[PDB]
Design an enzyme around this catalytic site. Structure first.
Site, PDB file in Angstrom:
ATOM      1  N   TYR B 136     -49.871 -11.741  -3.409  1.00 20.60           N
ATOM      2  CA  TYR B 136     -50.639 -13.114  -3.481  1.00 20.60           C
ATOM      3  C   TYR B 136     -50.285 -13.690  -4.377  1.00 20.60           C
ATOM      4  CZ  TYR B 136     -55.998 -14.121  -4.327  1.00 20.60           C
ATOM      5  OH  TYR B 136     -56.659 -14.765  -3.937  1.00 20.60           O
ATOM      6  N   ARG B 183     -58.987 -10.772 -15.931  1.00 22.39           N
ATOM      7  CA  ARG B 183     -59.878 -11.331 -16.659  1.00 22.39           C
ATOM      8  C   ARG B 183     -61.301 -11.357 -16.209  1.00 22.39           C
ATOM      9  NH1 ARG B 183     -60.018 -17.703 -17.630  1.00 22.39           N
ATOM     10  NH2 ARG B 183     -60.188 -17.419 -15.422  1.00 22.39           N
ATOM     11  N   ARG B 193     -65.501  -9.696  -4.580  1.00 24.83           N
ATOM     12  CA  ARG B 193     -63.844  -9.729  -3.929  1.00 24.83           C
ATOM     13  C   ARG B 193     -63.019  -8.523  -5.020  1.00 24.83           C
ATOM     14  NH1 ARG B 193     -66.263 -13.537  -5.702  1.00 24.83           N
ATOM     15  NH2 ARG B 193     -66.144 -14.870  -7.729  1.00 24.83           N
ATOM     16  N   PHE B 253     -48.178 -30.710 -20.499  1.00 26.25           N
ATOM     17  CA  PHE B 253     -49.328 -29.806 -19.553  1.00 26.25           C
ATOM     18  C   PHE B 253     -48.833 -28.394 -19.461  1.00 26.25           C
ATOM     19  CE2 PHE B 253     -48.363 -29.392 -14.785  1.00 26.25           C
ATOM     20  CZ  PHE B 253     -49.911 -29.138 -14.417  1.00 26.25           C
TER      21      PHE B 253
END
Ligand SMILES: CCCCCCCCCCCCCCC[n+]1ccn(CC(P(=O)([O-])O)P(=O)(O)O)c1
Lengths: 334, 334, 334, 334, 334, 334
Positions: B136, B183, B193, B253
């Site tokens: 997933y 978290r 969910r 980034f």
């Protein structure tokens, strides 16, 4: 290790509470060059600010300041301003000036000459239009950015393209000066000096001083936000100017003051405190605290974060709301 | 020039809680490519998350989303999620997507296709095994890291090896995704969910929602530590990945999000607040605050500090205590 | 890879709260080399520290410590100190020492040898003259700087000059040690330890302990300031040292502690709180907040800034006032 | 990759004997941008050259050529010129034009619009004054120099100033065009095209074709030297322009053509073979053969050696001798 | 200055037709490492080449060649090749090999071993499938590229990513090896050695030696162009590999050979001479002979130029023509 | 701009066949400094060579030449040499000389002084020992290399080491002068001048002039080879010197003449033409054909190839055969 140069760095720290460190951190010859450039500029500014010096006496002093750099014994003993020491012991400073390589001397004297004329021109008048605001800021700060850029290039630590790009170098100065002029409204009111553009504040009140009265607080903030929106237009040039730099000591010297100016604008935006005292330039978000201002990509990110800080606080009713979003949109998109 | 690109950056800041600044700070071509990539992924994410969209109606949207990128007028007007604006004004975003050089479109479209397949596959099943959890995470995050990697290499700002090592790139995504899932346990509990792997929590409770019960608090924290221990296994790949970067804007980034994720895991470790509310990120040691995550050696140090912060907090009575030390020891010894 | 090397890193993290992360962030061979060096010095420190070990037993232990590095089975099981684990399992540490390239061993052993002799010499005496203060600080800190420097140059990640200029490397140690000694006055008092040079504090009070008495606060602060002024003299060397480094991992390692030491002295200067408890490290302000200690120009700026923090606080009545201004003035002009 | 882009590069190689290779060697974004810019300029040039097109059809074609870049289906089938393939398959080329970043599109379209205007204007006349010669060259070469410069800046591979200083960009084009024009005197005559400035050649003969008649050679060569002297005046700008470049791929692209042009002016100077056949561009001098045109100092050296070559063969009897010496004196003295 | 090292350089020059100069131009430690790496490879190859050696005797040698490097007195006296001196005086070579840093020795020894193994593998079998042709070239040249790449990285003059990318380093080798084989069809003929892939030539003639017969010239040239087309597929990797390099001495060393290889394939394409004796290396054009092969953009232009020389001379009637244009098109557009 | 500065460069081009171009390509203030330095040296040289000047009148001119630089109207009108107008119009040169910065003036005057003394000394004697040959070359060329090196350092475009290491700078000069003296044997002879050291040629013939006689051709070549071998010894210093330069314009200026000298030696080696006509530099090789002399590694490579050109032509019976091989070996090995 001369005693006179020692004295110059002593004056640098006395007058420059916050630029001294980065200046002293510059590589090679730039160090002394910039230190001396700062001292002569500081002495010139002290003359301009001293209101006990009559205009007819002041004009010649501003016009001829650049030539005093070559008069070993010249000094001024009537200043009453806080930084009069650089005036009273100017021979020590002019001596080290004449000790600098000729290439730096030429740039420094040239800037002083041009700044003198510019300062004299605005002595008698107040800034009217925004175009005149740019002109006045060009004289007292834009020329400084240009002068510094030429010193960087002359030293070879920076590419000659840096000193050549006078337009963006000028914008660097314009942004810092407009910011300081914005923030120092109150401090300047009590000083009897007016720097906010008349053609801008007169659309809100009859006397610039009116912004100091509690009942005009809303109108004050609107004008504040308008002047800040104006200043933000220099950011693209600032980013372009900083992006060209290649020397780390030079980058730190140039980048840090700009970011501090940006943090200041963000703190003052739509802030009533500007008109009641000093503004609480407070903290930033967790991304600004995981990267400092010593590399270009980080400087951009820090700038963008401050921009969103202003963006999120833009009141729909504010007369400048659309333009404020506009310039920020431009900065974000580039 | 393009007013549509400005709108895209506006959306980026509305939808990105903290990535906008570092994305906007990316050099040249990467700036727009990553901005748009982020936006289409956000639109896709919004479709998946929308529970008012029945599974039967949703699957075809997920499967064909990569093609909608080439349907100029396509948009979705039936969403009620907060980021629905990117779906409703998708034409503006897909227009800018079609303006990117084709080599970037290819990469983005491919990740969107593969991600649609994966998201659809998980619409009618929760995550069971740990291997399924990686499955997933690969689909919703792993592929994003792979996509970004291929863009970095195609832009030539990073080495060809960056985009080729799909495993390390996948790990970057897996680390961030697991960290967020850990978290946001409580927040996902009210939304309805479930993401925590069933095979892991099923051994601590009968219903994942049980950890919400203040009586199972201890059981919850144990499971919490096991998953956190699971996530820590990606770190050595994150280090390897970041150590290959050479462009500063890309490095900023890529590094910052990983560091923020690690700090989050440390804050959540053996922390009971994870099940009672918001977990406050605690400041780092004196050394970390002395350095920002913009150079590889500093990122390593910051990472090691967060590791030791979890290490001296491992309860011997924790069923994973031994496994946690093992992976942390493997991270320290390289 | 080996279980002994990981065990070493486990010890490093347990016994090195301040250097663990930066050591593990070091490039190539320096990593293990410095990790081991730190572990052996830690053990040596633990023996010297342990007061349940008789002088009769300690002297031979300190003088021969370096030789234990070569004896595969040597260990010590009678320490009662918290870090005793490094002594009890010394075989594991000595094994890794022997696995290091021979060149690294030459350095670590040589330092342990000279350090042992120095510590043994100070077992039956306090520090008298300022000259003995330097001597002592060289034995426990200076030599560490020299050893590390030699390891950097041996690894070739830094130039030979770094390991060759022992005076500058020594100065790095002395600055940190004098700073810690000044800082921990009170703590060391509640520990029967004396390090402040008697030739200095005797000119203020009869006993060093008196400084802890409210009616002596003024003399204590004067003494504090004199010693701090003493410590500041090492700054030119600290700057010279850091400015010669070329490796980022080594720079982070060396620079941060120095900056933290300077910050400490800045916070302790003319601060009565030194004698009532542990002093709160004031925060850098303005320029220091926007830059980390990861590039040389920024570190210079940080250092210069903390120097002015001290300069601004120098009261004319303090007996060291002139000397404090002088050294600072020297740091600025160099 | 797309088949259309591959096709564009196929045409680039078909229509550009020289430039193709250096264009393909340009870094990143400039590659496709310059390739496409070159092709459309080729197509426009092919229409301007086709004498079978009735001016009643031609002028609107040159005037509107820029608009065809946006019309997917536009093409021209009535051309018999050799490069008619780029006109017949313009859709392939325009497609790729519309694939370039918008910032490049506007530059290319703008240049094509302006060039179209200029080409049409000169369709019914020859060059009269030298001022008209600059105007003509501006339209067919100068604008190309200005366009490429705007593409270089927009790509960020070159400084913002390169794109802004249009005068220098213009001179790059004027110099190459005048050079080719001077060298192609005969080919133009045996073609029915008149490019040499009338106000210049008229002072020598009645008809430009007269320079082809063996008894006018003394006047022909005299006119030749005057034109050459005129072209040399652009060299100072060429050196300034080249001196701003910082990207090696762009430098190679820009410098090589200029050096070949300058070498050509050296071979043609005071050479009567210009009126008989094709001139042979010999090889560099003892030093020119030791350096290639890949770094600015070397390019300067090469330019100077060619200048001195002309300076030597300057007849005292030639009417332009004084001017020819003055221009060269200015070039070599900076 | 070692006399054994001088002898090694004497041998390097003797055994090196065109690259001794560039090897001697290598910075610092790469200088000797590569010189000796070349000498040992020279020896290893001379062994395989000798036919006066039995297969069952050669195999063990090739297999253990890498071990001889650590056997001071080892040497081969029964060889009668051109460069037998490196075998008869191998002790001199191995001595110097043993003076190299261990990091270089490991690399060189490793490559020799893997190479020895691979070489012995093809002692009895010919080259059949192209798949095997790549396997062969990998053992005799491909591995050399990897070796050299690792030495560059190990020396640190090149980024660790250089040595890391084994696939493109391998291609560098396969391109040279295939090129030389293609060029040396005739020499390898009068030696009894067959290198051209069986599956390729057999499909044209039954006797690979047939191509030496005038009656099968067209049958030959066809096979030639086919193999050349095969080699051209490596150019993208060569370009990518060379683009990563950052050290000038390394760049010249790597680029020169690749360019010569390309120039050779250019000269050999559709050329009968290939079957009648060595071919000439014709001239290029100014837009290259105006730039050496010492900067990537120049190398690209040079390569693109040669690609055109091939493309322009592709015969419509060649069975591989389409594929040739295909790979050249890919090289042009990438 | 300066009329006198323009005249200066005009003379530079008239009196400098091989230095004008590279001199004019120097960065910043090195340009004019070097120009003037070369002009004054040319003037001093024009005096020493004029035989219309009695020795008793020449000595004073040479000894006080350095002083004429500070005498606005000094000049010389009785010279008959070809470059005589540099003395007749010397005030123009002295004027620009005085325009230079003191640091530059200091160096030139110093060398002019020391050179005048040296030249004056060899006015009556001829070169006897090889030791005197060096001394002579030192005065007429070695000093030039030193002066230039000191100018590079003063300008700061190069490090201090360049001007400090007078040895290497001296070698640069000796290699060029010796090479020229060797090459110009004949015209020097037909001019009544002797520069070949007597202790070398007297071993071959009774009079140096005997090498002009056809019957002594073989002996002349043997001497030629011995002298060339002598010159080769300066090559190590040349490479060292060049490898320390960091400025491109300075590198080109220094490298090109040296590489030109090396090529010249390689062409004169064992060449009878040296005593009959002019020696045509037979260019480099096909590996160094893809290399110019503007980067160090390429320069090394070019040098090594010329050395091998000489090495392969060494006659076994040549009396210096061993010595020549010895030094070439030293150069290959470093
Ligand atoms: C490349 C970036 C260049 C940015 C140049 C910005 C120039 C801004 C005007 C500076 C004019 C020279 C200094 C005149 C005297 N002056 C007035 C105020 N200051 C700043 C000092 P302050 O007002 O706070 O006492 P400090 O904040 O450096 O301690 C200095």
């Amino acid at each position: 290790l001369s005693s006179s140069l020692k004295t110059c760095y002593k004056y640098l720290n006395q007058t420059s509470r916050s630029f001294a460190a980065v200046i002293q951190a510059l590589d090679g010859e730039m160090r002394n060059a910039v230190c001396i450039f700062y001292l002569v500029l500081r002495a010139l500014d002290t003359l301009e600010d001293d209101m006990t010096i009559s205009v007819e006496k002041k004009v010649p002093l501003l016009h001829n300041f650049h030539s005093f750099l070559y008069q070993p014994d010249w000094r001024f003993m009537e200043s009453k301003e806080k930084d009069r020491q650089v005036l009273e012991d100017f021979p020590t400073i002019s001596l080290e000036f004449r000790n600098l390589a000729e290439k730096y001397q030429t740039v420094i004297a040239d800037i002083c000459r041009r700044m003198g004329i510019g300062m004299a021109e605005f002595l008698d008048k107040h800034v009217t239009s925004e175009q005149e605001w740019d002109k006045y800021c060009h004289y007292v700060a834009g020329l400084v950015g240009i002068g510094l850029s030429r010193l960087f290039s002359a030293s070879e630590f920076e590419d000659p393209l840096v000193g050549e790009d006078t337009e963006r170098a000028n914008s660097m100065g314009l942004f810092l000066q407009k910011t300081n002029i914005i923030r120092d409204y109150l401090e300047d009111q009590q000083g009897g000096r007016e720097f906010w553009p008349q053609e801008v504040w007169s659309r809100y009140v009859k006397k610039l001083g009116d912004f100091a009265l509690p009942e005009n607080i809303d109108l004050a903030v609107q004008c504040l936000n308008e002047l800040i929106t104006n200043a933000l237009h220099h950011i693209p040039d600032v980013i372009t100017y900083l992006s060209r730099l290649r020397n780390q000591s030079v980058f730190n010297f140039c980048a840090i003051p700009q970011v501090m100016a940006i943090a200041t604008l963000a703190a003052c935006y739509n802030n009533q405190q500007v008109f009641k005292g000093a503004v609480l330039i407070r903290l930033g978000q967790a991304v600004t605290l995981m990267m400092d201002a010593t590399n270009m990509p980080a400087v951009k990110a820090i700038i963008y974060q401050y921009m969103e800080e202003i963006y999120h606080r833009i009141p729909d009713s504010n007369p400048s709301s659309s333009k404020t979003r506009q310039i920020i949109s431009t900065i974000r998109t580039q």
